[model samples]
Target chain A: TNKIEVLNWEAFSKKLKDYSSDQRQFHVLKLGFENRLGTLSTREELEEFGKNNNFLVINGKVTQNIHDFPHILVMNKGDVIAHNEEDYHNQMRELRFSGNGDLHNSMEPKRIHALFKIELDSNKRQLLNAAGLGTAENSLKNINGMTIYSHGLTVDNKYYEDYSKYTHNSVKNINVTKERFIANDDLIHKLIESSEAMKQSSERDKVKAFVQYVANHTTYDWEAANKAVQNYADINYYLGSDLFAVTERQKAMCVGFSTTAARAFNMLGLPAYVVVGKNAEGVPHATARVYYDKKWHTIDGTGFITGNKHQRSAKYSEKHFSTIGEDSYDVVEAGQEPKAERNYMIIDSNYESWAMKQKTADLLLFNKEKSLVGLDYIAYVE
Target chain B: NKIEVLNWEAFSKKLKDYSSDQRQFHVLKLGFENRLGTLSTREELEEFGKNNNFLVINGKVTQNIHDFPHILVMNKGDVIAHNEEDYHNQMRELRFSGNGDLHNSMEPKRIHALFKIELDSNKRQLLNAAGLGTAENSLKNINGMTIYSHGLTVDNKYYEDYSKYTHNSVKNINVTKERFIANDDLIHKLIESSEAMKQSSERDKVKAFVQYVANHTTYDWEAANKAVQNYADINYYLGSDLFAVTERQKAMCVGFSTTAARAFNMLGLPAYVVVGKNAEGVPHATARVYYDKKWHTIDGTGFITKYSEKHFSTIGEDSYDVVEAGQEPKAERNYMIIDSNYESWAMKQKTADLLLFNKEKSLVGLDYIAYVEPTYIT
Candidate 1:
């Protein structure tokens, strides 16, 4: 009977979004509905929803609890809009608001993580539709246990994958080294500890184990890879091509395999670094160089798994690389040095071994904007 | 009377909206002697446009101050002369009279020629640039959507621009549903460029095109892996579209067959890219092109047609009489069996894509429906 009130939440939400809250009690409405849009008829359901979604209210003069004014209203997007039950009939009573003056700042979590998760699902739907994919008519034979919803999306009933893993919200810091890109997480530690290669007496045996493990465990993420190739601006969504894809999802592009293996090797006290380049066939690819026996040999852990037409039997190589896939890595940018504040190296010559390093600070002495501050200062002497 | 319109704009829009039975048009003055020639619907119009400067539609011309490249709307086959003063000075700048209309009559001879700019061409420009291929060709867009080039042709050679990776991003799995495909435009360009293809019979035209592809295309054994992987997309079956041959210039059998079938089709010859397994259990691709009025196996990449066996079957058709439908049989020469009966989703999807391209890309139609429906008629 009160379902119209429930449907009215949408109207109320839009009203507030258009800044209708300026007029007191005009946009605010107490609707009956389950918490989290669960579609139930229980009051407790709404309360549980309110605790997370509830607006934190307090008196400006004296500290008061949010529960103190609990005449639970519907969620305003995620946060709830509420007033005192005594003021439920008192339409003129103004809604109390929380002042952010170092009070109730440490109360409950913002529930932002769950909020981001929901938004990503909605965003992916829009992205897929806009991309002219996920059509039902042309997408029947496409499904077996899996269906590709968009360019970067695949739904395998059992696998349940998010191919376009995208997020605008930044995750809170855990272990990003300020100067470096690699993270030394417990997941990394566990992988190293469990590695059979780590148990090896020498770096050679350990590095071999790391490469084999990657080849065996990592599944190629062709969907996201295809999309990123299409739109390089969405390089962040190429999680499978980076450290995140391997650590969290156990999937990879060539870069994912390269970076993961290198991180492990470095953790295990082996000298390994990555080089960004292309393979023999001109496919832009990534590979690692491991120093084992006092010499750096290339280790390319990622390659396409040529799956048999009717079977999972992939031509997944071993069965390959580190000799570089055909020893054919056409190196473009040496991967190890892109993110440097300053660095130095030798250009060996008989006449003079030129020595130099970058001085970004010295170049910054010109205070005015664009005045030699970042003109790429390189000081070298012959 | 030549009504001078102002500004440079695309006439492709006007050309598309235009409908008329008037086959003859003259953009130049002195009418009959300055005849631009006659044309039919699309083909003849294309031919005339290539041979002449002003691509005509009904009574309008594209070359004017308003539509710079495009002239003014004119009287068809009606002598329309331009003033000399307007020809030299007012043509580009369009200095107007007291009314500010950009037209000037000859002060010397009372007689006139609307011919300010002399149109120059050697039949080729009219064909390619007459209207369709240029930026002004409004007919190019499909369903209000833009058609991005898969690659580019540079110095008589097509270079693969892998920047967009357009092949993998292709959403149009069913080309038949698409109103007008632009890929065919490039295929036509490739065929016309070859002298052998332009002047020869359908049989030799096919030979010239396939031979050209075989000669230029390197057998990239590595890309063979990519071919089979893309079971869903015909656009990137190894080399996919014509770019595999023209731009990338290297691909496996799939690329070879894809280029062969589409180009052969462009010449109104029916062709299909056939995917199958050889008697050796190895996966491979080939093209069955309809030329000499019968389907023949093409091995632009190999010896299957050159020196190898001729009998191939996507239809499991073992011999002349038997309908070897479900039974996955092999070709006599390569022992090639089409993927029609293959149970794998990869094989199934690839067969579907191959079937579609055969229909959409071919200039001539076919009775073939199922991938197992035999194209090769004895």
Candidate 2:
């Protein structure tokens, strides 16, 4: 029995704006908060809430000192209130999060990935809008505070877009919804069943102790691969080709360590894939191609991981490699001897599939690479 | 001479089921945006009492807290405590000055030396109109301190209205306790030449020296983001177990409890370091050792910090650390000792248990308060 009661909050935020509920609907919200405090976890229940109702009155005055301030608790069974984890991190430190290609330095506010409603950090800038007032995807959208409008937009901060007067919305006007990052194949089989490199005993030394544990413990998320330039379609490079957010933020991107070293050599029993190419500056890369002693070799874990402080500035595969960086495009690293097509050769090699496709996150957000650069620091339209 | 005046709406209607210290004479109305109208200018009450530290002559309210007005702030946060005769008889006048040897250094109805005057409310409500009280003045017996309060309920039911404390009373806090000292150890030759003490029990030498300090220590996150803007001054020697095992390998949370109490006193077991509060009450520190028979609790910088499976509470079974010598103690009184070199009271909980407890249920010390073997002075 699926319950329902949203008095048309803009037709239920435009029916799951940008959609992702093939279905699992649990809802229990009464909502109403500014404060109804309770969550007092001991300094004796805050000194018995201060030796018992001693004193407080903010904005009207008594400013601080409930035993020198860091306080909370004001429960009631009537209205609709319950906030804690430090008044929800003192109300998410004035909130911020702009838009497009890896949410330009992804704002930090934990939990509640997207529905947008923070506004008031002096409205970040370049907000425009008016022209087409979005309906399904041409992007503007806000919802639980409700804005939901759209047009040819791209975005930099807060909201505003203009792929050229009217290009049908959301390159990054904020939409997120994947219900907490996708497919980790249960944290890639409990991190390759807690490896010393999965007790090797040869399946070719368990794909050479798994390409030396993703080239000596991963790292290259070159600050979201150098500030997420034209992200070949972004929700962080479509969950940067998942493998549990590239093994729990040890950080990634070389198609999430070549699609988790080709699905951890097909969940360890062996057989792999992932090669997509285009480099020597036309850029677009990905590597890994196992099967074992019977052929196909080339393993790379982001070009044989050696002391790199950081380099890859731009040219990261165009539309997952080959929008046209040609010789026929093919490329790049690890034991390096781990196998070789080596670096920039140009082969159709054709494999790619580590499996994650909302039609490959709508072709890296509507066909990779761009920069018509419209709507500068505007701040008006709405 | 226990004074008795009241007016700011029956002292915030007995401050939401008010729990104790039943105040007597009070009013403090620092501009409720001037609600209940006009009559408050002595140059706007001495420039909102000089933007708030205090002094409003000719109309009264004076200096150095000797007693009576322990709390009542209102240049704009509004609180008034320990005194109020039902809103100073509904402010038709509302007065309290106390001079003449300020009633001979107060305690009984503390003659009201004046703590500003502010107002705004509802359960006497002020869960943070600016800060000071509510969540029944912020309760505590100590379990998990992250609190907040604001009221109302509809088609749902719950409702409270400190009606801006119906009108006034609140401000004054005397919670003292700040003790800290390391004004100072081989850290036992890297815990007597660690290969993580060749394992084979004492739970694999306390899981191979907490997996060799969680594989060569690194939890510094920029000195814990500049030591949490000093959680009101919550430091328990943030570094140096011989400068965290020979030269900044990084440390905090009592430099991994004085490097797991000199690696359980250089291996042969029996350690200490408890200083409590984690089950979300925050301020933490670990170590307990004694092994397989009891005392366990470990941590190597919280590798399993509770619900990651528990530790940071227990030993003399939780709560009690008040410390008051110079002052600055609140991120929930970070388990108080701020610092110590065995400052007695029976060696301050056996040097905060950097020494012993319950010799194994047949009972020895700290289920309530308790002690120890092993000795060292450096």
Candidate 3:
């Protein structure tokens, strides 16, 4: 069996380090060299290398480029498993990728890596969609054979070209209509009417009640969660991304929960952000931060309530929503800091250690009234 | 969006009725019989029991034998006694001294001490089958009478006097329906194993047995978390079988401590599980062994991977320390030490002490050992 294990940059580097120490000589060839008439001899060498490495036959022809040449098939000792002539030729041509010895330029060719790239693309689309900069298709072109889905600014959308330059929080100057922002205002209004505090008409009370309602209603779904984002990958799809989907379905991962929360808060004319960063374990986690008590306080919609009784009590939710500042900011590892400036809040060391002990699911609810005594959010602006 | 919601009214309909003190005792028995459920905390139990002039005492406060930090939710009135026999004698004496209706009715008012403990459904069923057949009748509601009523009943049924001799309170048994027979056999095997080590010191025997149980069981984090989420039944995540803990080597702290205490008692050493927090304020549990006129903490969970001397404690950070009314004992607190911090947490913990099992803690001269062998339920 052709066993191909995907390696991230760090793991790829470690593999290279081990490769340097081992005395075995491995013949490497650049993929797509056969297409360039000058490198026909290089193609023959790749073919020979394929025989020794037991490279699996790739079914389709790859337009040789920097991105397509990630994988270098290494054979310890086994027969190559090519099913047909086209498959064998394509597999040989795909192996001709340029490896510049620059550690950052290398990565193990795996479907997961492709998925990671798609997530960043999807992230840009999501940001644009939330900002009402563009409309996007429900699904994108298939990656290999798998249906790569996205909900955001499509390639044909007006903001597609500008997406590369736009940071997550940037381009706020563009005025988007309320219609574009509200996917289902009827549902939001209904949710508001159902709450006694929301109907009270006090700005703070409405926002607090909405936050609490969102927290208490939405449940965290484990399998669909984007824990892989910790590996520096973005969420590639928006299965449970929108406000209506999260509230109606009652099941979503951290990103889905946060995005829906922020969107719902915004719909209520309150400021909120879909805060994304690594948790104590350096795993990427998302939370919703709302402007409350004259400061942006962190609240977890998913942690406020539980569908199962075996789950820990909602007491933890009270702890997390206590306050946001140095004492309550979530902990992140040195390299795992959010790439965007708007993605994190300034936190003190004492809170950092405390936040480090929390799990992603544990980060959901913060009962402000109960545990937030003497706790205040520091002044932070985007 | 004008949604009609299901409020507490809807939720209240599904909840069981436990208004009467006797009904509450039935609920406790039902909970143990199903191998499921947990009380809110000790304070809640105390509050409920106090309304009827009953005193709730945690078995850990009196003896070294307990499963999941057992509590004796006994209805103690104004009589002082040592051991179950004395307690019964005093209860009978008070029944004559007090009004006849207070002590004679189905809901007897005489000092009714219920040693509420967690037990496996298999053992609970068997114990019931042998005498009462798991039926809820007047037999279960009789006050000041033996709950199990005999058949070499598991200990702490009548509250043994541990002042002179070292005693272990049997709060609960851990067993699975599938491997119930194997686990029943394992108890006998552990007893035999203990007999082989008769030459060993009490401390060494206790330490060795704790380590043995620890080495056999692997700590299950998912099971622990799931135990909380699936409050309806612990069996969904935690295995109640001895093979699950020993051969398969799977368990959370509850299972680990339960098996550890089970082994310790089998070897004639009194032990109990300390259910509380570690330094991090995380809900954690470990076990303790009675030796040298004091309770020494022995964490069977520590031996799941490899024995850590830090878990084997006579004093210092690992010693059992019970603290004050509302505060948890600090970082150094263990199963044996009693501090104000532990008392604080203990005051809040929900203790379900069902006075059922009755193999005497002092099993020195029990001629009924032959009939006391663990039996296969089927």
The global C-alpha lDDT for each of the candidates, from Candidate 1 onward, is 0.37, 0.34, 0.36
In model 2, the runs with Cα more than 4 Å from the true position are A1-222, A226-237, A240-275, A281-382, B1-378
List candidate 1 stretches off by more than 4 Å: A1-184, A189-382, B1-182, B196-200, B225-238, B278-281, B302-325, B330-378
Model 3: residue A39 alpha-carbon error in angstroms? 87
Instruction: Tell me the deviation in Å of residue A190 in model 1.
Output: 4.2
| Candidate 1 per-residue lDDT over residues B1-378, each given as its tens digit | 333321213333455455333333323322122223322334444454432223243255433322223222222211223455654442232111112121322111111233323322211121111000111111112123221111010110000122122333332222221211344455555666654455456556766666555555576643444444542222233244334565556566666676666565445554555555544446666665554434455556632213112322222112222113355453433443332222122222222233233244544344332223245652
| Cα displacement (Å) at residue B133, model 3 | 45
Number of the top candidate by lDDT? 1
DockQ of each: 0.01, 0.01, 0.01
Error of 3 at A296 (Å): 37
Q: After superposition, how far is residue B20 of candidate 3 from its true place, in Å?
A: 59
As for lDDT, the candidate ahead, 1 or 3, is 1
After TM-score superposition, the amount by which residue B115's alpha carbon in candidate 1 deviates from its true location, in angstroms, is 61
Tens digits of per-residue lDDT, candidate 3, A1-382, equal 2223423334433454454434223333222122222232233454454432333212321211223432333221211223344554453331121111123222111111111112324333322221112332332322234322222211121222233222221212111122322324445545655544446555466556765666566666553353234231112122344333455556567656666555445444344545555443444556665554445455555543333332233545655543222123433334455554422433233333332232211222211211111233222323
| DockQ-based CAPRI category assigned to the predicted complex of candidate 3 | incorrect
Clashes of 1: 26
Number of residue pairs clashing in candidate 3, backbone atoms closer than 3 angstroms, sequence gap of 3 or more or interchain: 65
> Cα deviation in Å at residue A291, candidate 3?
35
| Candidate that beats the other on lDDT, 2 or 3, i.e. the better one | 3
Report model 3's TM-score to 2 decimal places. Answer: 0.26
